[PDB]
Write a protein that holds these residues in place. Structure first.
Motif, PDB file in Angstrom:
ATOM      1  N   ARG A   1     -27.826  37.597  61.083  1.00  0.00           N
ATOM      2  CA  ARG A   1     -27.492  38.801  61.836  1.00  0.00           C
ATOM      3  C   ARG A   1     -27.936  40.018  61.096  1.00  0.00           C
ATOM      4  NH1 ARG A   1     -21.293  40.190  62.765  1.00  0.00           N
ATOM      5  NH2 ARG A   1     -21.337  38.293  64.059  1.00  0.00           N
TER       6      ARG A   1
ATOM      7  N   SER B   1     -27.362  44.040  61.330  1.00  0.00           N
ATOM      8  CA  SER B   1     -26.457  44.968  61.997  1.00  0.00           C
ATOM      9  C   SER B   1     -26.486  46.316  61.305  1.00  0.00           C
ATOM     10  CB  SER B   1     -25.034  44.403  62.070  1.00  0.00           C
ATOM     11  OG  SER B   1     -24.398  44.480  60.804  1.00  0.00           O
ATOM     12  N   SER B   2     -25.819  47.312  61.910  1.00  0.00           N
ATOM     13  CA  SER B   2     -25.744  48.649  61.339  1.00  0.00           C
ATOM     14  C   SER B   2     -24.515  48.748  60.410  1.00  0.00           C
ATOM     15  CB  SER B   2     -25.677  49.692  62.453  1.00  0.00           C
ATOM     16  OG  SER B   2     -24.538  49.461  63.269  1.00  0.00           O
ATOM     17  N   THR B   3     -23.961  47.596  59.971  1.00  0.00           N
ATOM     18  CA  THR B   3     -22.825  47.525  59.034  1.00  0.00           C
ATOM     19  C   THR B   3     -23.042  48.481  57.849  1.00  0.00           C
ATOM     20  OG1 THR B   3     -21.613  46.034  57.531  1.00  0.00           O
ATOM     21  CG2 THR B   3     -23.847  45.476  57.788  1.00  0.00           C
TER      22      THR B   3
ATOM     23  N   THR C   1     -22.287  49.910  51.960  1.00  0.00           N
ATOM     24  CA  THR C   1     -21.366  50.158  50.830  1.00  0.00           C
ATOM     25  C   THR C   1     -20.024  49.430  51.007  1.00  0.00           C
ATOM     26  OG1 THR C   1     -20.270  52.129  51.775  1.00  0.00           O
ATOM     27  CG2 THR C   1     -22.344  52.530  50.579  1.00  0.00           C
ATOM     28  N   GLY C   2     -19.759  48.955  52.221  1.00  0.00           N
ATOM     29  CA  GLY C   2     -18.474  48.327  52.548  1.00  0.00           C
ATOM     30  C   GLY C   2     -17.480  49.329  53.124  1.00  0.00           C
ATOM     31  N   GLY C   3     -17.910  50.585  53.266  1.00  0.00           N
ATOM     32  CA  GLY C   3     -17.097  51.630  53.875  1.00  0.00           C
ATOM     33  C   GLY C   3     -17.086  51.471  55.386  1.00  0.00           C
ATOM     34  N   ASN C   4     -16.641  52.518  56.107  1.00  0.00           N
ATOM     35  CA  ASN C   4     -16.512  52.438  57.559  1.00  0.00           C
ATOM     36  C   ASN C   4     -17.570  53.274  58.299  1.00  0.00           C
ATOM     37  OD1 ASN C   4     -15.110  51.245  59.798  1.00  0.00           O
ATOM     38  ND2 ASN C   4     -14.232  53.276  60.223  1.00  0.00           N
TER      39      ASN C   4
ATOM     40  N   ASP D   1     -20.293  52.426  59.852  1.00  0.00           N
ATOM     41  CA  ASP D   1     -20.964  51.231  60.346  1.00  0.00           C
ATOM     42  C   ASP D   1     -22.021  51.522  61.426  1.00  0.00           C
ATOM     43  OD1 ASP D   1     -19.601  49.176  58.713  1.00  0.00           O
ATOM     44  OD2 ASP D   1     -17.848  49.671  59.848  1.00  0.00           O
TER      45      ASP D   1
ATOM     46  N   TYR E   1     -25.357  52.215  66.621  1.00  0.00           N
ATOM     47  CA  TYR E   1     -24.672  50.982  66.213  1.00  0.00           C
ATOM     48  C   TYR E   1     -25.337  49.800  66.846  1.00  0.00           C
ATOM     49  CZ  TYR E   1     -20.602  54.188  65.445  1.00  0.00           C
ATOM     50  OH  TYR E   1     -19.767  55.223  65.090  1.00  0.00           O
ATOM     51  N   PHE E   2     -25.472  48.684  66.123  1.00  0.00           N
ATOM     52  CA  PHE E   2     -26.029  47.498  66.758  1.00  0.00           C
ATOM     53  C   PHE E   2     -25.731  46.223  66.000  1.00  0.00           C
ATOM     54  CE2 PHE E   2     -29.570  46.060  64.083  1.00  0.00           C
ATOM     55  CZ  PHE E   2     -29.682  47.117  63.198  1.00  0.00           C
ATOM     56  N   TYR E   3     -25.855  45.098  66.726  1.00  0.00           N
ATOM     57  CA  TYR E   3     -25.917  43.719  66.218  1.00  0.00           C
ATOM     58  C   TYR E   3     -27.147  43.075  66.797  1.00  0.00           C
ATOM     59  CZ  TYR E   3     -20.626  43.323  65.395  1.00  0.00           C
ATOM     60  OH  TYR E   3     -19.291  43.493  65.056  1.00  0.00           O
TER      61      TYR E   3
ATOM     62  N   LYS F   1     -11.568  53.867  51.385  1.00  0.00           N
ATOM     63  CA  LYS F   1     -12.230  53.164  50.291  1.00  0.00           C
ATOM     64  C   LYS F   1     -13.045  51.985  50.829  1.00  0.00           C
ATOM     65  CE  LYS F   1     -10.747  55.999  47.358  1.00  0.00           C
ATOM     66  NZ  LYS F   1     -11.530  56.938  48.204  1.00  0.00           N
ATOM     67  N   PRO F   2     -14.109  51.541  50.119  1.00  0.00           N
ATOM     68  CA  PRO F   2     -14.893  50.424  50.656  1.00  0.00           C
ATOM     69  C   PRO F   2     -14.229  49.051  50.512  1.00  0.00           C
ATOM     70  CG  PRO F   2     -15.804  51.068  48.536  1.00  0.00           C
ATOM     71  CD  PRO F   2     -14.668  52.022  48.827  1.00  0.00           C
ATOM     72  N   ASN F   3     -14.591  48.162  51.449  1.00  0.00           N
ATOM     73  CA  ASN F   3     -14.220  46.748  51.469  1.00  0.00           C
ATOM     74  C   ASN F   3     -15.510  45.955  51.274  1.00  0.00           C
ATOM     75  OD1 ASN F   3     -13.159  44.154  51.909  1.00  0.00           O
ATOM     76  ND2 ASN F   3     -12.866  44.477  54.125  1.00  0.00           N
ATOM     77  N   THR F   4     -15.855  45.618  50.027  1.00  0.00           N
ATOM     78  CA  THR F   4     -17.100  44.885  49.798  1.00  0.00           C
ATOM     79  C   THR F   4     -16.920  43.366  49.834  1.00  0.00           C
ATOM     80  OG1 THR F   4     -16.765  44.993  47.394  1.00  0.00           O
ATOM     81  CG2 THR F   4     -18.185  46.721  48.383  1.00  0.00           C
TER      82      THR F   4
ATOM     83  N   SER G   1     -22.846  36.223  55.408  1.00  0.00           N
ATOM     84  CA  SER G   1     -24.151  36.440  56.032  1.00  0.00           C
ATOM     85  C   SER G   1     -24.041  37.214  57.343  1.00  0.00           C
ATOM     86  CB  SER G   1     -24.874  35.119  56.257  1.00  0.00           C
ATOM     87  OG  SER G   1     -24.060  34.195  56.953  1.00  0.00           O
ATOM     88  N   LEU G   2     -22.877  37.161  58.020  1.00  0.00           N
ATOM     89  CA  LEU G   2     -22.678  37.882  59.283  1.00  0.00           C
ATOM     90  C   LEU G   2     -21.597  38.924  59.109  1.00  0.00           C
ATOM     91  CD1 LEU G   2     -22.518  34.732  61.692  1.00  0.00           C
ATOM     92  CD2 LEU G   2     -24.598  35.785  60.647  1.00  0.00           C
TER      93      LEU G   2
ATOM     94  N   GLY H   1     -20.077  42.561  60.815  1.00  0.00           N
ATOM     95  CA  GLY H   1     -20.049  43.423  61.991  1.00  0.00           C
ATOM     96  C   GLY H   1     -19.796  44.888  61.697  1.00  0.00           C
ATOM     97  N   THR H   2     -19.510  45.637  62.778  1.00  0.00           N
ATOM     98  CA  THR H   2     -19.330  47.088  62.711  1.00  0.00           C
ATOM     99  C   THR H   2     -17.971  47.588  63.191  1.00  0.00           C
ATOM    100  OG1 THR H   2     -20.288  47.384  64.924  1.00  0.00           O
ATOM    101  CG2 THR H   2     -21.858  47.442  63.078  1.00  0.00           C
TER     102      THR H   2
END
Ligand code: NA
Ligand code: NA
Ligand code: NA
Ligand code: NA
Ligand code: NA
Ligand code: NA
Ligand code: NA
Ligand code: NA
Lengths: 373, 373, 249, 124
Positions: B22, B24-26, B29-32, B34, B150-152, C70-73, C121-122, C124-125
């Motif tokens: 996949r 995606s526009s995730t 950095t793991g932030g929000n 996305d 945004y996309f997947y 804060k980030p969730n890595t 690997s997958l 989302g947003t």
């Protein structure tokens, strides 16, 4: 003594010199055939013949078959006061009770209503005094029978009719209004607008000689264009004045509304019981206004008029019922014929496609004309 | 071995040679955050660059700001297969996902949907195989920024692409169709109708060379007349034949409907997600039909066409997205420009009053013309 | 209509965990008897889970409204709706959220760990995004593969929402293991009452984790105007109880 | 009570019309959050006075609530008299609607007042 008064306070006061009477279509045998015998096409009948002094204060009517099978535009109601051989009330019965054209719809106003089933229960609370009798006549101008005519005429018999009681009048009129020679220049869209300096081409919904006051109007417009039909001002000529003393700003404005509306609305004194429900204002609209708290008084004469579009530019199919009181029972102008007041067809997508074709040809018949050029 | 099969039965079978991936526009950095960084006016970006063999089988997109602020008619999606320098998919993104013009509305079909909030959730289940990579590009043709994209892009990586896998194609077209020289003679209302034996002036929604099959059409009509827009027949030319082998009866007929409809309706394979909601068929209608169980096959070429009114008599603002498969990734015709595909204004009561005026003039301006003469 | 193959029999059991009787239980179980089960047929699995998710120690910092995000890595604190070992594919999820705040509950990303990989690997947003929707929706919607059959019908997203997505054309395959997770708010900041049913196939019939107890999965009361008036009072006190505080200070 | 004074009952929030009283605009949100317009005309039943009248209403029981309130009062008296000074434009400006972001901030203050426990539902 206290001068306290209002509708509910005065209702609690005992009343003198009144006696209830009622003429109805009740089965005289006591059976359940509580309607009159059928009316053949063209037949007239006196349904109520009252002697002496009194005041009618409640009328209810229903008819079988219902619309559209039997149009209430083609049944005439007439009322004759004080032994006169002319009617002081003359109108197609549907339009008299606030049911336009050949239609049916529920609505309620303070003096007039068309209640369930879907506008077939007709009621009237206008008070109608008389000194030397009253006659109510029904005429079937339809090509088919009135199978069953039901009614109540409730009134108060009085030994002495109060001082200063007037006489109730109502008149139906109809006009297919004439556009200006330069065309339907509403909003200055198709050509320059001009001033209406005389009101001579205005639609006339009431014209009488006497002393009294105007109390209501039912206005039935069938507009053949999607253009707004109501820029026209009301104009009133009181007691033969050359310049009208009451001049309005617009038709929706006169009906206590604004901004070219087309929404159903109800107030005891004004409302829109039937709206066009189509593009722009194309089709049929019924508007009413009752002048109960605010009548239009006159000492000698009154001419009530309204423009049919600004400066009377539009072709409108207009009919009205005007209601008023005056000092004595007087005659009315000649009624429109059945053919003259016939409902017109609704303009449809085929008609408008033909207008589009003429318009495209006026623009050189270019293959990609959109329509807003 | 049993030959038992169907969708739910086969879903229970273990599958070999597939691995989920996949893009995606995730937020990396793991932030929000996305979504992708903003697109300036005119900016292009490759949003997905896949190497090797695989099959895309789910795409989801959303965009900020939403319509009408940011029209999805002015954001282009393009897809390039097998390392080609030309796209095999090219369309304004709203129309690609079944959202016409600059509008938004919820609807669901089996391959394409625009879900809540009010048509902003775009999803696609067409399978898109590729052997030598895939590239998905977004181009902002709006005059403002794409604030957030945004996309997947969900796909299956395959060590070996099964050998008979085709390539997905989709093409947006637009025309302001030309009326006949004699005018818009639909239904023979304004003049005599003539036969269309060739399809020469038909609107073309798809034309290609190769082996494959047509699987769908999104049809966006903006009709500038209240007249019914859909008398036109679909006409298909398979493998260069001179006489079209597939000839239809009408546009609503082709879309599995009948009798000039204008009602919202939903079936997995066909429907009306947006109807004109005005007099006759004036305004905008979106219709779709997917040919999943019943594709239109071709071994050498296909030309998919439809009349714009009977014998192509009408001026219609028409756009379409055609979807199909063929044996290799091929090029498309030039796209309509932003100016060419701009949504047209709605014909309104002022425009039609001007048509009425030209029509009254064509009838000699009789002061009481109704409109049906 | 899920197909459920079996080679050495099948047993379907019903358990009444209510405090009253099941007066009448009606059913049909339609199946095809086969002399030979085709060899690549998998086994149907489904598992219900429930959690009352824990807010971050700093509080429910969704949208950065009450504090910095804060980030969730890693996905360490994500809600887990499915975890198994074997070869197969994930085919669906019923997602039942009861949100105790009017704040949007669905900023959280889906995150999948296939075959023991360290980085998912997958990824989302957002939750509405994962359910093929967008822009914090709360409208009923139906597609054969996804939809919102029950929406909160209240201020913001306060109350109950049921969302589903079936992966029929687009399953999530795995050869050794799968861990299906989703954030409960961005970086798992929100307290949500969440339950899920995950549906999948794998090569053999395997065991499931212990079920939530009746007490653990009990529906929660709806937050109401009295509860929120008490929140307003604590908030007014935090602002120094100015007599004309509006509520947007 | 206020709904009682407006000839209604039981904390209503339904549109209703009578010639003398009604609710032409209701809050259409959780509880009674937002805007409500109520009216009552005293046509059959006016409030008479010989020397003076002061018409008042509590803003919540014992005036406990912060409400944005405006009113128009209609009356007759024996002669034309002056009125109190009008509110300014700024004083009578409509206020913003309390929204989900504001209430989430209230929830946060409330959670912190309860020890910031990670599983607070909201009804504790
Ligand atoms: Na009787
Ligand atoms: Na009887
Ligand atoms: Na004059
Ligand atoms: Na005017
Ligand atoms: Na993400
Ligand atoms: Na994220
Ligand atoms: Na045809
Ligand atoms: Na997110």
């Amino acid at each position: 003594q206290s001068n306290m008064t209002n509708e509910m306070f005065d209702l609690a006061k005992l009343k003198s010199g009144v006696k209830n009477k009622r003429i109805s279509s009740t089965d005289p045998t006591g059976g359940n055939r509580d309607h009159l015998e059928p009316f053949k096409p063209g037949e007239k009948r006196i349904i109520a013949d009252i002697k002496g002094m009194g005041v009618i204060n409640h009328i209810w009517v229903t008819i079988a078959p219902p619309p559209p099978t039997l149009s209430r535009n083609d049944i005439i109601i007439r009322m004759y006061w004080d032994g006169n051989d002319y009617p002081s009330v003359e109108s197609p019965i549907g339009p008299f009770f606030g049911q336009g054209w050949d239609e049916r719809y529920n609505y309620a106003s303070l003096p007039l209503s068309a209640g369930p089933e879907n506008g077939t229960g007709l009621s009237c609370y206008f008070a109608m005094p008389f000194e030397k009798g009253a006659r109510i006549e029904i005429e079937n101008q339809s090509d088919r029978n009135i199978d069953a005519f039901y009614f109540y005429v409730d009134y108060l018999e009085m030994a002495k009719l109060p001082k200063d009681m007037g006489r109730f009048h109502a008149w139906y009129n109809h006009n297919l209004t004439e556009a200006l020679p330069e065309g339907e220049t509403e909003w200055g869209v198709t050509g320059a607008q001009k001033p209406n300096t005389t009101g001579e081409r205005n639609y006339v919904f009431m014209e009488t000689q006497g002393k009294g006051h105007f109390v209501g109007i039912n206005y039935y417009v069938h507009c053949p264009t999607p253009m707004w039909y109501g820029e026209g001002d009301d104009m009133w000529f009181i007691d033969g004045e050359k310049v009208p003393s009451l001049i309005g700003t617009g038709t929706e404005d006169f009906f206590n509304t604004a901004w070219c509306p087309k929404e159903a609305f109800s107030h005891p004194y004004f409302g829109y019981p039937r709206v066009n429900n189509d593009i722009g204002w194309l089709g049929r609209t019924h508007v009413y206004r009752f002048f109960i708290e605010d009548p239009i008084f006159f000492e000698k004469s009154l001419k009530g008029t309204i423009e049919h579009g600004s400066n009377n530019n539009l072709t409108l199919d207009l009919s009205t019922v005007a209601y008023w009181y005056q000092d004595s029972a007087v005659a009315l102008p000649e009624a429109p014929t059945k053919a003259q007041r016939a409902p017109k067809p609704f303009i449809n997508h085929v008609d408008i496609h033909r207008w589009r074709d003429a318009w495209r040809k006026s623009k050189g018949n270019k293959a990609t004309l959109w329509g807003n050029e």
